[PDB]
Design an enzyme around this catalytic site. Structure first.
Site, PDB file in Angstrom:
ATOM      1  CD  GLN C  15      48.281  56.061  76.142  1.00 17.64           C
ATOM      2  OE1 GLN C  15      47.440  55.896  75.426  1.00 17.64           O
ATOM      3  NE2 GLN C  15      48.938  57.177  76.500  1.00 17.64           N
ATOM      4  N   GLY C 134      35.526  51.782  72.234  1.00 17.86           N
ATOM      5  CA  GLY C 134      36.893  51.301  71.397  1.00 17.86           C
ATOM      6  C   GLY C 134      36.589  50.245  70.492  1.00 17.86           C
ATOM      7  CD  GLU C 245      34.962  37.237 100.815  1.00 15.68           C
ATOM      8  OE1 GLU C 245      34.367  37.788 101.648  1.00 15.68           O
ATOM      9  OE2 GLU C 245      34.848  36.020 100.841  1.00 15.68           O
TER      10      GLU C 245
HETATM   11  N1  LIG Z   1      41.774  57.204  80.642  1.00 16.84           N
HETATM   12  C1  LIG Z   1      42.364  57.028  79.361  1.00 16.84           C
HETATM   13  N2  LIG Z   1      41.386  56.725  78.303  1.00 16.84           N
HETATM   14  C2  LIG Z   1      41.634  56.320  77.080  1.00 16.84           C
HETATM   15  C3  LIG Z   1      43.142  56.285  76.787  1.00 16.84           C
HETATM   16  N3  LIG Z   1      43.254  55.935  75.363  1.00 16.84           N
HETATM   17  C4  LIG Z   1      42.081  55.996  74.978  1.00 16.84           C
HETATM   18  N4  LIG Z   1      41.167  56.335  75.914  1.00 16.84           N
HETATM   19  C5  LIG Z   1      39.736  56.453  75.692  1.00 16.84           C
HETATM   20  O1  LIG Z   1      39.337  55.348  75.219  1.00 16.84           O
HETATM   21  C6  LIG Z   1      38.226  55.658  74.506  1.00 16.84           C
HETATM   22  C7  LIG Z   1      38.544  55.188  72.994  1.00 16.84           C
HETATM   23  O2  LIG Z   1      38.991  53.832  72.752  1.00 16.84           O
HETATM   24  P1  LIG Z   1      40.313  53.210  72.378  1.00 16.84           P
HETATM   25  O3  LIG Z   1      40.762  52.393  73.472  1.00 16.84           O
HETATM   26  O4  LIG Z   1      41.062  54.495  72.181  1.00 16.84           O
HETATM   27  O5  LIG Z   1      39.936  52.331  71.238  1.00 16.84           O
HETATM   28  P2  LIG Z   1      40.623  51.096  70.809  1.00 16.84           P
HETATM   29  O6  LIG Z   1      40.258  50.017  71.817  1.00 16.84           O
HETATM   30  O7  LIG Z   1      41.876  51.348  70.552  1.00 16.84           O
HETATM   31  O8  LIG Z   1      39.774  50.413  69.451  1.00 16.84           O
HETATM   32  P3  LIG Z   1      40.050  50.847  68.107  1.00 16.84           P
HETATM   33  O9  LIG Z   1      40.880  52.248  68.002  1.00 16.84           O
HETATM   34  O10 LIG Z   1      38.567  51.476  67.673  1.00 16.84           O
HETATM   35  O11 LIG Z   1      40.455  49.656  67.370  1.00 16.84           O
HETATM   36  C8  LIG Z   1      37.946  57.120  74.235  1.00 16.84           C
HETATM   37  O12 LIG Z   1      36.845  57.295  75.433  1.00 16.84           O
HETATM   38  C9  LIG Z   1      39.286  57.610  74.922  1.00 16.84           C
HETATM   39  O13 LIG Z   1      39.029  58.795  75.496  1.00 16.84           O
HETATM   40  C10 LIG Z   1      44.003  56.355  77.689  1.00 16.84           C
HETATM   41  O14 LIG Z   1      45.103  56.219  77.830  1.00 16.84           O
HETATM   42  N5  LIG Z   1      43.636  56.587  79.089  1.00 16.84           N
END
Ligand SMILES: Nc1nc2c(ncn2[C@@H]2O[C@H](COP(=O)(O)OP(=O)(O)OP(=O)(O)O)[C@@H](O)[C@H]2O)c(=O)[nH]1
Ligand SMILES: CC[C@H](/C=C(/C)[C@@H]1C[C@@H](OC)C[C@H](O)C(C)(C)[C@@]2(O)O[C@@H](C[C@@H](OC)[C@H](O)C(=O)O1)C[C@@H](OC)[C@H]2O)CO
Ligand SMILES: CC[C@H](/C=C(/C)[C@@H]1C[C@@H](OC)C[C@H](O)C(C)(C)[C@@]2(O)O[C@@H](C[C@@H](OC)[C@H](O)C(=O)O1)C[C@@H](OC)[C@H]2O)CO
Ligand SMILES: Nc1nc2c(ncn2[C@@H]2O[C@H](COP(=O)(O)OP(=O)(O)OP(=O)(O)O)[C@@H](O)[C@H]2O)c(=O)[nH]1
Ligand SMILES: Nc1nc2c(ncn2[C@@H]2O[C@H](COP(=O)(O)OP(=O)(O)O)[C@@H](O)[C@H]2O)c(=O)[nH]1
Ligand SMILES: Nc1nc2c(ncn2[C@@H]2O[C@H](COP(=O)(O)OP(=O)(O)O)[C@@H](O)[C@H]2O)c(=O)[nH]1
Ligand SMILES: [Mg+2]
Ligand SMILES: [Mg+2]
EC number: 3.6.5.-
Lengths: 431, 431, 431, 431
Positions: C15, C134, C245
């Site tokens: 995203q 995640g 660097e």
């Molecule tokens: N800044 C930001 N943080 C995000 C976003 N999407 C998820 N997060 C953060 O990422 C974390 C969750 O991980 P995700 O990336 O949603 O999980 P994933 O990698 O898809 O892993 P699974 O869903 O567990 O397979 C949390 O701390 C969320 O707040 C985004 O678009 N922007």
């Protein structure tokens, strides 16, 4: 082209055949008068396989109808397609044989056959390349089995290199509709085995189950039952009548289905069989079809393949579908259920594809299984046979026809060995 | 002039041919009516009216297949006598194809061929298309080759063949027919090209990103390969390669002559827009196991010889660079070889068939490859054979056609030696 | 040419990537269709039609996310195979991401990457985007890095990661996944950039003076930071800084490599009109605790190294002056450092995305900062871990996926050491 | 995509399910005939999660309906959406079991299940990635509990790695609507605990309270009660069916909600539930929603969370809202009422956001709480259980079905230990 002679024998055989020809004529655009009103050039192009273009636009299905007595064939002639047949191909006597195999294969049949064969010869003479013969008959029937068996022998005598196959109606494991079934059936098989190149086993019993269940029917009329059977028969020779991707000649089927002579009994199946009440909740995919084809519940023979293994399976598809789908799907079956296939043979599946679907079925398939589970049937028969035989039950109705008691013991011997053979291969292993 | 005769045998051979000749016409601007509204005299002859007549012979004991051709789009492109049909097929029975049925046709075929050959100013060789397992393809071809090699002992004998892929189906008696053919093929063929339907399906799924393919486009892919090869004769190139040179540059030991084939860059327009198909890019793709037309992970063995055929917009120096990189990729080669790369370049880029499923490219690479990895496939085949032969499954179908049981033993023996040969080659000769 | 490969993993990674590539296109005038109606060959490749194709790989076991991309505005900017999806996600389970699920995808991913890398004339390094916690981001990335470092042991391995902010939520099993990843990350990553969602919210509230922000603009802010970094490669500057660097100028001790980041001058147009954003002004803003992208009051520790990236209208001498002032501001630095400032200057000013919530400026500063203050955050994390681990909360979810219980102990052990490392660095080395 | 199998069991289960499917179909634009008339591409895009695109535009919810006797499922088929279901998925016997758990799990169910599972298998076969199973059943019901329990066990046997969750209807603390509740419920739980991965507890009692109070209803018809429940169910899987910001896969929910196997009982909640008479006096903000979500009075399970602590809470939001609002608001809850959360676990909240609101509710949320207060329920049950059991009340209606009395003592043992477990964690502390 190659031509097939369709012989019908016995009440059953004739009734089935009547429906069969209805189906075939329908597929080729042939109306009840024998006039061609088809839409595709294919319908006509290879019509020769079954019909003999008599004159003008009148085609005459090359079939021979045989019975020991009238009142059957008569009704056929009174039916919708009675006039499509050439009168001279109706050969019958004026005597019965209340399920008296001996009569059918001796005292009565020996007279009738003297004619019959003459007609056969004439029909074969009109052919350019006689593919073979198809016999529709019912086991246990005085005519069907009696004459049936006789004719088969007599034909091979003069056409040893042709493919002969029959669509026998076998005995039911449940309620028998005859008294002396065991005898008649056993006596027929005794010779059948050593003649016919391949034969199909269809059991009314199983058919009823399908109808009440899968087809959601409440009034399974014999006509309907016959229709179903007819469909299967037509599928078998679609490869001859129509173009496709993988055409499988009748002979070819024998080659990939019979591993050893004698062991040539098959369990037929058919898909799709969805009831009209639920057709709208179907997908009609290659996977769907294989689900039905390998469903023990859709076996038209009253045996449960689950208890045996497949020596070989043929799958003939009609209509449109990909090669990829078919092959892969068939593979999946063998892999997922490998225990149900005989390890002796790598690739237990033969496939074929014709581009011409059944009327109204974009996708359809027939199933021919050579399962060792068929042993079950023969086992049942033998058991019932000896039960009666040891009490000399009704033997006077055979002895009185000049039958030698020894013939029964010989018949049993063959039967028992048949069972043994299946049993050996059933569990014989590579190492 | 350099001339070439194509021969198409059996369902596959013919049906593939349909795709091929379709393509040939397209590339040369020849219209279905043999019309051309200067490199044709290789595959086409000129008639009195100027009309083009392709130089091929179609043989199929199953008239159905040819009838499709006779009534098809390109029915105007064939001199009736080029379409030779039988009355009954070989039913997947090598013995029928070779000894009992094909025997009665082969005379005609050879005569027709001879007459065709007599129109030539300099025949380069023959291109035979067939399938292992097909009674006609397998059995008949065996016979054909046996006799062609007599009349034309010095002409190139190339063939393409469908190699019963490890995990597919279609027929049961495959491994029998396959080996039986191989056993004789080894003594007459100069070079065979193996193609697996299985592998192709994978390619369709992953490269073309399609689903549900049939022979109507599986063959199209194949025809691209064929074109690529013969393009050398048909069009000017930087490095033209005559058919004869394929022996020298592929075979290093008589008995071994089964190159694999591939073809890059297969791809849908969808991806074409997002991908730069450079010379180097494509060249690399050719050595990616995934893209082989044969189910054989090349990494299991070593390469004996490779041949690259570039079409269209390529630059000698770029090609060389790409190859050098390939050599670096520690892809193993046998010690017996120090080069391993023979390269042809043709100016005529690939074309595209209207309604096809393959994006048009500015350049493409066809690769032929002789590798020891194929030994695996041979082993698999032999293994399957052993299993069936042990019990003597289906053997009676061959013996009944005059085949000698010992003949199977003989064939197997030779196959064992063949496998061994590959083993010896990959020994990594060292003091 | 200097080339760079971006990798986006998981919901966040992807995203965020959406925002990034959106921005990249804008800055280079690239239209959603890959069209450009001379510094592109770093992130974009040229296809046959000239079309631009960004150089990135998107991986997400949860196909939903990618589907949004596949059906989004920029669906025309990606070569299908750059969008790799799974069938089932990691359910916030590091073990799934690393051992049981990711295991089955990683092969594909690496192959795709390799092919991309093979298009390069000189790869600088990789930019991996993921989130701790995640299952995919955390777990899968761990795996990915493990293997990337093998093939590309000398390429820069930069990553951006969302650091589970002290007081936020989203997932419960965070601290487990976080530490598990860190434990492996330390052995492969060259430099990670920590970002807290929490901190950003504060910034949105106070600097942007907005309320109710979502990832649709939180990510936009982040993308500005990313751009600022890579702008060095993409545009000429007074002091261009190659990615390599950043190791030298940020890391002073292998195990320590977690710079914080900030970005000035965040601001709404409302205030922009009333405020002169001078070089000095902005520079000062970068060191105001309030403006950090990580919830860590920098005053709690000392600075190890800072890196300033100026964009747009700046003057070397003014920059120097500003820095000198910063040095005066008795902001503490470790004794191990005597300079602490490495500065890059790029001529290309910041841009602005149509419909964004950030005013366009004539100049901006992105700052990366390695500080011992981060140790606090690590302690917090470890503490949380300890609490859950003690009772073994949720542990069975990992063990059930093949994780070793002792593995947790191992990770924790290493984390303890890490924290200790920071302590030692801030010792204020003195005789 | 990932697919879910929806199994409905018992009168209750089926009635709820009927309403459930009504709701789901509504959300995806599916009318009663199964025809798609949606507005957004999203509705169709991921419809696969529940519906199986049969043919044409007819979608068939993949649900299985089970009951020991007709008169229930019949009424379902007579209802508005009866025809949307595929007849073949209605599996039922012809015998009752007046809340006779034994019958349902033995003497009657053991027969019925032989079918049922076959259908399940078929449905799972049609899936690409079987997400898991959902069972709608009622505790205390001869079918619901009897068959329910049985089926669960049988499914795990063949699908051990799938997520199984159920929405059980639990016993009421107030007036019981059955006599032998304690027994049936206890017997079910005895096995339930060791199978199902997560289960929800909904109590009609609580629902009535909500209706009379919050919804200001006077005629809380079961249909309305079911509707409310259905809403909750749909919320749970919205993340699978639709795109969002933080998608939470069914599995993910399990991971962040279950800290220890066995302890997997949840209290569901839902917001907003404002009566139409007062909807105009609402704001509908993230704060408003959380006020309702954490209001003990809105717990759909008849327990008072005020007397326990939360091990973990999941909050799933639908529609539009900021990330800032949500996260901060959830934080506030934990901070303000920290005593209600278990100190063992930092961050007791899991959040998720989908961008697709319920029809007519711009903002909506579901609440899943893992509170130790659920102990209360089990405590009540155990007490009532032993009260009856020690008097041997009605045991002859179980003993007579072949149930071993020991099973009751074992059941109790599990039950009591369950209580103990909750009690331990209830007050267990970090130090
Ligand atoms: N800044 C930001 N943080 C995000 C976003 N999407 C998820 N997060 C953060 O990422 C974390 C969750 O991980 P995700 O990336 O949603 O999980 P994933 O990698 O898809 O892993 P699974 O869903 O567990 O397979 C949390 O701390 C969320 O707040 C985004 O678009 N922007
Ligand atoms: C493969 C040849 C074949 C042998 C077997 C064992 C095959 C294998 C599979 O079919 C290919 C079963 C199949 O995958 C299903 C599970 C979807 C299913 O069709 O199984 C049957 C019961 C099964 O026997 C148990 C069936 O009768 C049968 O024959 O199964 C109930 C049915 O209810 C809808 C459905 O649940 C004989 O021709
Ligand atoms: C946090 C989880 C949660 C536990 C508690 C204690 C929470 C805390 C707060 O809500 C979040 C209370 C809340 O801030 C309010 C005061 C506005 C209010 O809603 O409290 C209730 C009574 C309260 O219990 C006393 C409630 O039942 C409840 O559950 O409260 C009357 C109500 O009349 C309009 C109103 O005055 C269980 O899910
Ligand atoms: N690629 C491809 N393979 C084919 C085609 N037709 C048949 N095959 C393959 O060829 C093998 C079967 O041989 P066929 O050529 O059909 O048999 P035949 O040569 O006609 O011989 P008989 O029918 O036995 O007389 C199987 O492996 C099929 O999958 C085709 O059009 N394309
Ligand atoms: N499937 C089917 N079976 C039939 C039909 N007519 C008779 N039968 C069966 O055939 C057997 C009786 O033999 P039948 O042909 O009437 O005696 P036959 O005239 O002496 O040969 C029994 O098993 C009947 O159930 C029919 O039209 N269809
Ligand atoms: N919420 C709800 N509860 C129901 C419904 N129908 C029955 N029940 C409850 O389910 C329990 C009775 O079990 P029931 O499903 O009818 O028995 P079964 O058919 O043997 O499983 C009682 O607690 C009823 O209050 C319904 O439609 N909705
Ligand atoms: Mg053929
Ligand atoms: Mg994800």
């Amino acid at each position: 082209m190659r031509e097939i002679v369709h012989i019908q024998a016995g009440q059953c055989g004739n009734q089935i055949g009547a429906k069969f020809w209805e189906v075939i004529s329908d597929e080729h655009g042939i109306d009840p008068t024998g006039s061609y009103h088809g839409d595709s050039d294919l319908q006509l192009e290879r019509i020769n396989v079954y019909y003999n273009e008599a004159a003008g636009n009148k085609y005459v299905p090359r079939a021979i109808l045989v019975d020991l007595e009238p009142g059957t064939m008569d009704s056929v002639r009174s039916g919708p397609f009675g006039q499509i047949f050439r009168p001279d191909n109706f050969v019958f006597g004026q005597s019965g044989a209340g399920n008296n195999w001996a009569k059918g294969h001796y005292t009565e049949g020996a007279e009738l056959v003297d004619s019959v064969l003459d007609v056969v010869r004439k029909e074969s003479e009109s052919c350019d390349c006689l593919q073979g013969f198809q016999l529709t008959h019912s086991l246990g029937g005085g005519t069907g089995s009696g004459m049936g068996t006789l004719l088969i022998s007599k034909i091979r005598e003069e056409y040893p290199d042709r493919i002969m196959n029959t669509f026998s109606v076998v005995p039911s494991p449940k309620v028998s509709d005859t008294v002396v079934e065991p005898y008649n059936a056993t006596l027929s098989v005794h010779q059948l085995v050593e003649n016919t190149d391949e034969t199909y086993c269809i059991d009314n019993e199983a058919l009823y189950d399908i109808c009440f269940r899968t087809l959601k029917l409440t009034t399974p009329t014999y006509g309907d039952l016959n229709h179903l059977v007819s469909a299967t028969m037509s599928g078998v020779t679609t490869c001859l009548r129509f173009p496709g991707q993988l055409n499988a000649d009748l002979r070819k089927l024998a080659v990939n289905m019979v591993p050893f002579p004698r062991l040539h009994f098959f369990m037929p199946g058919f898909a799709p069989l969805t009831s009209r009440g639920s057709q709208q909740y179907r997908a009609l995919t290659v996977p769907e079809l294989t689900q039905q084809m390998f469903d023990a519940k859709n076996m038209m023979a009253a045996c449960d393949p689950r208890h045996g293994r497949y020596l070989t399976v043929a799958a003939v598809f009609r209509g449109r579908m990909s090669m990829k789908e078919v092959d892969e799907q068939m593979l999946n079956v063998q892999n997922k259920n490998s225990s149900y296939f005989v390890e002796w043979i790598p690739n237990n599946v033969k496939t074929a594809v014709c581009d011409i679907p059944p009327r109204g079925l974009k996708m359809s398939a027939t199933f021919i299984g050579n399962s060792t589970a068929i042993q079950e049937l023969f086992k049942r028969i033998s058991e019932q046979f000896t039960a009666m035989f040891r009490r000399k039950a009704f033997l006077h109705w055979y002895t009185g026809e000049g039958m030698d008691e020894m013939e029964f013991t010989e018949a049993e011997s063959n039967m028992n060995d048949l069972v043994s053979e299946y049993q050996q291969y059933q569990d014989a292993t590579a190492d | 002039m350099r001339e070439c005769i194509s021969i198409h045998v059996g369902q596959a051979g013919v049906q593939i041919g349909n795709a091929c000749w379709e393509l040939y016409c397209l590339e040369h601007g020849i219209q279905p009516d043999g019309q051309m509204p200067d490199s044709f005299n290789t595959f086409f002859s000129e008639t009195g009216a100027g009309k083009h007549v392709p130089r091929a012979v179609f043989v199929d004991l199953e008239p159905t297949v040819i009838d499709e051709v006779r009534t098809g789009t390109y029915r105007q492109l064939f001199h009736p006598e080029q379409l030779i049909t039988g009355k009954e097929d070989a039913a997947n029975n090598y013995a029928r194809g070779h000894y009992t049925i094909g025997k009665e046709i082969i005379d005609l075929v050879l005569d027709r061929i001879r007459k065709l050959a007599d129109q030539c100013t300099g025949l380069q060789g023959f291109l035979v298309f067939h399938s292992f397992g097909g009674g006609t393809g397998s059995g008949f071809t065996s016979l054909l080759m046996e006799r062609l090699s007599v009349d034309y002992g010095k002409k190139s004998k190339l063939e393409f063949s469908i190699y019963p892929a490890p995990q597919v189906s279609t027929a049961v008696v495959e491994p029998y027919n396959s080996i039986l053919t191989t056993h004789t093929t080894l003594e007459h063929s100069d070079c065979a090209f193996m193609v697996d339907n299985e592998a192709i399906y994978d390619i369709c799924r992953r490269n073309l990103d399609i689903e549900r393919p049939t022979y109507t486009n599986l063959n199209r892919l194949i025809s691209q390969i064929v074109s690529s090869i013969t393009a050398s004769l048909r069009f000017d190139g930087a490095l033209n390669v005559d058919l004869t040179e394929f022996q020298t540059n592929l075979v290093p030991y008589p008995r071994i002559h089964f190159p694999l084939a591939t073809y890059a860059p297969v791809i849908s327009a969808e991806k074409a827009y997002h991908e730069q198909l450079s010379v180097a890019e494509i060249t690399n793709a050719c050595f990616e196991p995934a893209n082989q037309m044969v189910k054989c992970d090349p990494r299991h063995g070593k390469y004996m010889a490779c041949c690259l055929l570039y079409r269209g917009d390529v630059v000698p120096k770029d090609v060389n660079a790409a190859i050098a990189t390939i050599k670096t990729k520690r892809i193993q080669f046998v010690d017996w070889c120090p080069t391993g790369f023979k390269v042809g370049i043709n100016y005529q880029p690939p074309t595209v068939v209207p309604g096809g499923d393959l994006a048009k490219v500015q350049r493409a690479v066809c690769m032929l490859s002789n590798t020891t990895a194929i030994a695996e496939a041979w082993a698999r085949l032999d293994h399957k054979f052993d299993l069936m032969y042990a019990k003597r499954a289906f053997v009676h179908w061959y013996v009944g056609e005059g085949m000698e049981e010992g003949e199977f033993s003989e064939a197997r023996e030779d196959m064992a030696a063949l496998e061994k040969d590959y083993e010896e080659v990959g020994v990594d000769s060292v003091e």
